[PDB]
Every structure is written in structure tokens, then in C-alpha cells.
Amino acid sequence: GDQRHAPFRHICRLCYRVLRHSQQDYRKNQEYIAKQFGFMQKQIGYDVL
């Protein structure tokens, strides 16, 4: 939440953006990503999109 980590927030947001774009309307990519659901749950609420 500090101002000193704005580029890191930008990097994380871009990573989640590419994830969302990759999983869209595709079955194999969604299946591949869903394996990391346990990992990607615990990063919600930090404004990392």
C-alpha cells in the first residue's frame, strides 16, 4: 500500500491482466490456470487485480 512500491503493483496488475486475457473463452488455458487457484486465492484484497 505504500507509494514506494507503485512499479511492483503495476507489474503484478499486468501479470494478472495477461492471466485473465489468456484464460478468456478457452478451455485448456482455464484448466491450466485453475491448478494455481490455491496460490492465487491468498492475494485478493491487495489491489493486485
Partner: protein
């Protein structure tokens, strides 16, 4: 295909450098512009300032 291979290589290198916390500002710029290029690559569009 070659762009995808190169992007995977550079992303792996950046991750390896970042997991030790020994990166520099130019590397952060490179990875950020790489991720923007990846967004435009997967979406199929072109950069227009938006």
C-alpha cells in the same frame, strides 16, 4: 513462436533475479514494457496510447 520463446526466456531470467532481490531500475523498465507487449500480443491489438 520465436517471440514467445524469447519472452519466456527473459521472464524466467527476471524471475530468477527478482527472487533474490538484486535487480535494477532498467530491468524493471524492461520487464514492464515486456508485460505490456505481452498484453498487446495476446489480445491481438496494437498500441495506440490507450
Amino acid at each position: 513462436l520465436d517471440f514467445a520463446n524469447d519472452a519466456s526466456k527473459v521472464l524466467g531470467s527476471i524471475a530468477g533475479k527478482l527472487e533474490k532481490g538484486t535487480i535494477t531500475q532498467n530491468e524493471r523498465r524492461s520487464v514492464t514494457k515486456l508485460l505490456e507487449d505481452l498484453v498487446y500480443f495476446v489480445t491481438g491489438g496494437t498500441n495506440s496510447g490507450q
